Amino acid sequence: SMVSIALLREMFEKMVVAKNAELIGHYYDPDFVMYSDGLRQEFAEFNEGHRKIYASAISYAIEYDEDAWVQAPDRVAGRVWITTSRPGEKPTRIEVILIAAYRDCRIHRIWETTWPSWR
Amino acid sequence: SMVSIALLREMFEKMVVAKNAELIGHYYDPDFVMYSDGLRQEFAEFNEGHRKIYASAISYAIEYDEDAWVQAPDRVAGRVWITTSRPGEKPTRIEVILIAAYRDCRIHRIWETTWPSWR
């Protein structure tokens, strides 16, 4: 099945790359929780942090390691790189290995670690 | 299917926790490559590094996040914590999110990132 991978890719394209914070509630369950590099973030803080960042001059590109996907009912894991650009600064690339679990076609949990750590 | 998860758990129990480096060739394909925190390590360096470390006074415990597994044909992803103890030192816990791809019931690729970074 390609559903979970297609959903994850669509979220990255239409929410992240497009910096469209209004789509967070379309892609994420209201009870969503993110685990990332030692932090546990509930929906409210995830959403507000992205609303703030997406209002800045930042831009994002994404690359997927096409050899690293794992797909199962309502779940996906993969390896991605997010490249961030800011005005007058050199782009930076961060590697993210993440697991996403879905409920009713919205993301309910993500567990991820990054290299380098964003902290 | 439970095959890939069972294999990964057996490798962690019988190779890592037991510090049995002689089992590396039983669990890993001769063409295995590890991607970890920005490093790409082929079989030779992976094996030799583990033969050396396992000869030291170190010990390992493992915890699996039982809510984070993703399983597919010949592939698994999960979230684990490795706790390392050394004589006269406090134990340290590292979080690892990893994806393992299998060929013929041996691990052929791992892609992982850790928190904190072991580097």
Contacts of B68 in chain A (CB under 8 A): 99, 101, 109, 111
For B118, the 3-state DSSP assignment is coil
The three-state secondary structure class of B23 is helix
Q: Give me the count of residues in chain A.
A: 119
E strand or H helix at A52: helix A43-54
Q: Which of B97, B103, B114 to mutate to test the interface with A (most CBs of A within 10 A)?
A: B97
Exposure string over A8-37, b if 16+ CB within 10 A, otherwise e: bbebbeebbeeeebebbeebbbeebbbbbb
* Phi, psi angles (nearest 5°) of residue A87: -50, 130
Distance CA A95, CA A92 (A): 10
> Do the Cβ atoms of A119 and A37 come closer than 8 Å?
yes
d(CA B96, CA B88) in angstroms, rounded, equals: 25
Experimental method: X-ray
Report angle CA B114, A45, B76 to the nearest 5 degrees: 35
- The region, left, alpha or beta by phi > 0 then psi within -120 to 50, assigned to residue B38 is left
Which domains, from first to last, does chain B contain? 3-115 (3.10.450.50)
Peptide bond into A73 cis (omega under 30): no
On the 0-12 / 13-18 / 19+ scale of CB atoms within 10 A, B111 is buried
Contact B113 A116 (CB under 8 A): no
